[PDB]
Every structure is written in structure tokens, then in C-alpha cells.
Design a binder for these strands. Structure first.
Ligand SMILES: [Cl-]
Ligand SMILES: [Cl-]
Ligand SMILES: [Cl-]
Ligand SMILES: [Cl-]
Ligand SMILES: [Cl-]
Ligand SMILES: [Cl-]
Lengths: 119, 119, 119, 119, 119, 119
DNA sequence: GCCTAGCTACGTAGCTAGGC
DNA sequence: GCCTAGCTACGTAGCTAGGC
DNA sequence: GCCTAGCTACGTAGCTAGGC
DNA sequence: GCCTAGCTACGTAGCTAGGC
DNA sequence: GCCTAGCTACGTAGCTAGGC
DNA sequence: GCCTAGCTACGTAGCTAGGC
């Protein structure tokens, strides 16, 4: 129900966003500063293939309104590795831990979280 | 400390974002849906002139990464009118009341709030 | 077995060259004079529709190697009219009568007959 | 009275078509097939210089309405050689012998003879 | 021996510069000021037709190295009129009288006389 | 009061035309022949620096209305050398000696002197 | 109305394949 | 009026510097 | 009328020859 | 050598005249 | 490295102002 | 080999439809 980023052409149609309990490993970050001309995003998804137990972490970032750059990190069957990478990126960019996201608190000079719409 | 939108060229340098108690009348909204190609913003600011007790509500919206369209509604000394307009726009676009923003809860098909950075 | 001129787009696929006894009403004329820069053709076909007893005379002429101009004269069920038109054109251009074509003799300043190939 | 092909710029004004008894060594061939898109010519002339007893065979061929390609075969004073070349080309292209041209009969897939106009 | 200005296309080949005693009615004036960007000429010729007693005054002026503008004043048989016009132009432009040209003295802000070469 | 040629960009603003008694070492020559298409100038100036006893001879020549070509000959403190060069150029081009310029007489095929305007 | 991605409805340089 | 040097009032190819 | 070879009535890039 | 008028050695848009 | 706003470093059509 | 119809493999002006 949370869609694989359509820009991840290697995995779209072939994989789904990883879910565990209440955790959906899918997040859009955004940092907007009107004075300093900051207006950028960072998407992070932990993807599992539809066909087998094979994980990867997809990251895409850019100036808002651009495709920017991206990176797909292969993790094989190693879920823990993929969760570390996911969680560490989230922490690098927000200074909040992923498991504390219910109490997320924006830090100055780091990205905010943005809740996306799903169909 | 929260800057007047630089796109509001009529008021920038001449006015400040209105503050009262803990209320800063300045908000950035964002709605992003990857499936349906939604990627838009809506900024709302309640502005008070630096020189006198004169209020206006500034609104700017668009596809993210664009200047889009805008509207500056003059409210004279009528603060209540400006607060109504501000609060009603916020409610139209988020389905949350402005005074309940500490407990903001994103509604499907409406905009999320985004916390901006200030200098 | 003698093909309808492919340039006769109104009748091609829908009609055939008219035959009676040994008469095939299909002829290519050519007049070539190297000194006077004459190098032209004149095709005449008497066509009968495949679907019904309906006749027409198709004529196409030009500088050799060009589509030139043409004319399709509708004759309805009147075969005699179509034969007159056919035969009169042949006579105007060769000074030989159509029924004397076995003994055709080229007249100076008139067209020669040219035997085409059929598949 | 039968003109040297004007395209034979080496011999025109300097030579004439060779004649002997009733034989005029000058012929235009044409092959036209509307279905198979054949529409070509082949001219053959046996030329004798005006100044001396010197013969050549001129050949020009092409898509009708084009200059195509050509070949002038020098035969010196050897008339017999020039007659052989002339007659052999005629036979290759029509499957009729030159001396039987009064009874010429078009062969399917070979060229017809065309009588030209002279001034 | 003093040539009619070649730019006087109406009179060149048909007329000569007028002479009387030691007077040759032909003069080139020049005013050059390096500071004020003045660099202009004024030619005056009194012309008599070769064919008859018919006079005109030809004047041509411009920035040096340009054809500039000109004027040909018809004087009929009236020599005196032509001499007045000639002499008055000379005086307007040099502040010297024509008959005093042996003692010519350049006046500041007026043209100098320039002696041309003749063939 | 006689200006340094403005085209002498190395010396203009920094030097003056050399004067001694009644001698101003500054002259414009002009040769105009309407028949032979001669219309050229030659300027000669003997320049002394404003700052010190240092002389040079500046020459500029061309088709009238053009910057043409030029040459600045350095003479150091040697005034005599500069006077020789000046006077010799004048003589080469006019066939009159510089010291006889009060009685200047134009020679056929050599340049005339032209009196310039000063401010 | 605003805007623009991307599509539509052309044009064409020069390749290619078929006649000669 | 003529003429044209050189200036004015644009346009732009592609470099460069700053966000990401 | 149709068509187009080739001609007419231009324009111009840059060479060349003559002044300086 | 410098410079440039004007000439040379092209190219071409579209007119025109002759075949059909 | 990526990208592009906007700037830099030109070129120029045609206006304008000053000589004639 | 020659030639060229017509096709292929582009490019693009500006329309259009969908987000805002
Ligand atoms: Cl074919
Ligand atoms: Cl910036
Ligand atoms: Cl010359
Ligand atoms: Cl013709
Ligand atoms: Cl000026
Ligand atoms: Cl869409």
C-alpha cells in the first residue's frame, strides 16, 4: 500500500516496501530554508523482492522537483544489514533515531519528516 | 526569526511574521503522492507591517520547485479577520484546526505540515 | 493478365481491362524524337468493373518518367460508346485504326505503339 | 536523316549513323512493365565518322526520362566488328536477330523495339 | 588640363573648366581641425560646355573620403552670374576674395585652399 | 595651441608640439589628384615631452578619411636629429625645404601643405 | 486562469534498396 | 535634409558557483 | 491548364589589385 | 607590409518558356 | 561527482547624435 | 558500379492535458 518509488526502475513491479509489525520502512525527508535557499528531499525505502527473501535499501535525493541522484544498496538475505543502513541514513539526516519517530523532533539544520499519501 | 517569504516582494523588508504567545503564524504545507503525481506546497503567513498595526495574509502555492501563484489579502488593522483567513486556509488544506497543530494528524488526500528552518 | 494501370486508383482492384475475342483494349503509345525533344507517352485502357457491366475509358499521358495527367471517362453500360472513345483516341494519336493494329505503321509526327510486359 | 544521339558528345557533329542498302544501324529499345516497375530504354547506334572510314558502336541505356549510362566502343576501320557488336547487343536485349526485324516479335521479359521520329 | 570633377556625371566628357587670362575657375577647399573632429572639403568648379556658350557652377562637399552632397547650378549663357556664384561661394567659405587668392590667408574657422594635381 | 595628433596615443597628454622662435614643428600635407585617384595625407609633428628634454618625430599617413599607418621615431635629448628627420621628411614629400615654407610652391606629383585649425 | 511534461504533427538529412 | 561612428538596448552561448 | 529545365536576375564571400 | 573598392567566381529563388 | 540559476563575456540591430 | 524513391531515424514547434 506504500508504493515503491517509481524512479527505482530496477525494483518497481518486482519488489515491495518492507514491513514488520507497525514498521513500514519508507520515509520522505525534506529540508526547506527560505533564507539560505535550501529546498531538498531525501527518500529512503527498504525493499524486499516479491519473488524471494532478498533486501535492498533505495535512496533518492535532490533539489525538490528534480530526480537528483540515487543509490540502491544490495543486501542479499541480510535483513539486519539493510535495517542498519536504513536506520543509520535516517539518523544521519534527521538526528532522530528511526525507532523514536513517533516522537520525532525536527533539529535545526537537519531534515524534517514528511508524511506521503498512499493509494 | 521566521522570515517573511522572499517571494512576497510587497512586504519583505517592511513587515514581519505575526506572533502572539507561543503562536507563530507561519506554515508550510506539502502534499506528495508518488503514484498520483502530486508534489505541491502551500505556504501561509500572517504578516504585520513593521511601521504600523496593519495586517495581511500571504499565501503562495505551487508545484514544488516552482514559484506558482500567490495572493496577498489586505486586512487593515483587523487582526481577527486576518486570523480567521489564516486559520480557515490551514483547515481547508489539512483538515486540522490550527490551534490543534501540536497534535497534527495528516489526513489522506490533504496536505501535511512541514517544519521549515530559520536563521 | 494485362494489368489495370496502377495510377488509376479509382478502378485498380475493382475492375479489369476489357477483352473480346482476340481484342485486349489496352495500349501504350510512345513518341520519341531526339532532335525536337519529344519523349512522351499515352496509355489507353477500356476498363470493365469486376462487380457489374459498367465501362470506362482510362487515359494517362505525360513526359516519359512522369505521372503527367489523366482522365477517366465514365460510360455506364454503354460498351459501344467506350469502344468509340477508345478507338478514336488511338486513331487521333497514331493515324492507324485500332482494328488495323496487326499491320500498324508508324506515321511521322504521331505516336508509335509499344508492347508492354505482363505478369 | 536519323540523328546521332545528342548525348554522344564525342561523335555528334563529327559522325553519322551507318547505312547500307535498306539497313539503318539505329535502334531504340524499350521495356515497360507496370506491375514490376520496369520502365527503361536502350539505344544502339553504329556510327561512322564524317571525315574517315572509322566506326564505333554507341550504346545508351537508363530508366526512361534519365540519361543513364553509356558506352562508346571504338572499332577503327573494322566494320564487321562493329556490326557484330551492334547485332549481338540487339539480340541479347530482344531475343530477335537484327536481320529479322521486319518480323520483330516481342519476347516476354525482353525489350520491344520503338520506332523514333526523324527530321 | 584641370579636369572636370569625375563626380559631375552630367557634365564630364561634355564640358571643361572655365578659363580666362590667368584665371582657372577650379578650387578645392579643405578644413581640418584635429581637436574638434572637422575634416571636410568643398570643391567649386565653373564649367563651360564644349558644344556651346553655356555655363554652370558645380559644387561638391563632404567629409573627406566621402562623395558627400553636390549641386549643379545652371547659368545659361550668363557668365557674370556664374562668376558671382563661384566667387561668392569661395568668399563664404574662406573669407578671402577669389581675386586676392595669390595672397590667400587662411582664417580661423574657415577653409584653407588646397592645390590639386593635374595630368 | 597646436594639438598633438590624437592618434599618437603614446604621447598625447604627455607631450607638446615643439616650438622655437616662429617655428612650429607641425605640418599636414595633402596630395589630391582627381584623375589618378590620389587622395592622401601625411602629418609630421616634432614632439617634446612635457616632463623632460626628450624629443620624437611623429608621422601619420593614409588615404584621407583613414587612420592609415604611422611611426614614432625616438630621438632622446638629440634635438638636431629630430629636426633633421622632420625637415628631411617634409622635403622628401614636398620638394620644398622646411625653412622656405613661407614661399611654399607646390611641385607636380608632390604633396601640398595644408593649414590646419587650432583651438 | 496559471504552469509545463510530453505528445502530436509535422519536416528532413541522408541511408538503403531496388531499378538499370 | 544627407551621412555614419559609436552607442544603446537588446539577445545568448556557455562558464561558474552554489545547492545537492 | 499541367509540369519542370534552365534561365534570369539577383545576392555575396572572399580574392585581387591598386592606393598608401 | 597596410588597407579596401570592386571584382570574380561562385550560389540560388523563383520566373519563363517549352513539352504535354 | 551531479545539476542548473544566473552571470559573464561576448555579438549586433538599429537608433541617435554629430559632422556636413 | 550508376541512379533516386522512399524510407529510416532522427529533430522540434507548438498544442494539449493534467497538476496547481
Ligand atoms: Cl521497385
Ligand atoms: Cl544559493
Ligand atoms: Cl586606382
Ligand atoms: Cl524544348
Ligand atoms: Cl563629433
Ligand atoms: Cl499527471
Amino acid at each position: 500500500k506504500a508504493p515503491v518509488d517509481p524512479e527505482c526502475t530496477a525494483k518497481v513491479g518486482k519488489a515491495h516496501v518492507y514491513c514488520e509489525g507497525n514498521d513500514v520502512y519508507d520515509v520522505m525527508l525534506n529540508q526547506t530554508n527560505l533564507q539560505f535557499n535550501n529546498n531538498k528531499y531525501y527518500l529512503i525505502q527498504l525493499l524486499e523482492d516479491d519473488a524471494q527473501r532478498n533486501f535492498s535499501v533505495w535512496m533518492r535525493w535532490g533539489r525538490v522537483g528534480k530526480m537528483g541522484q540515487h543509490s540502491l544498496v544490495a543486501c542479499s538475505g541480510n535483513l539486519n544489514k539493510a535495517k542498519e543502513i536504513f536506520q543509520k541514513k535516517f539518523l544521519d539526516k534527521t538526528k532522530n533515531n528511526w525507532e523514536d519517530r513517533e516522537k520525532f523532533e525536527k533539529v535545526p539544520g537537519k531534515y524534517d519528516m514528511l508524511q506521503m499519501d498512499y493509494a
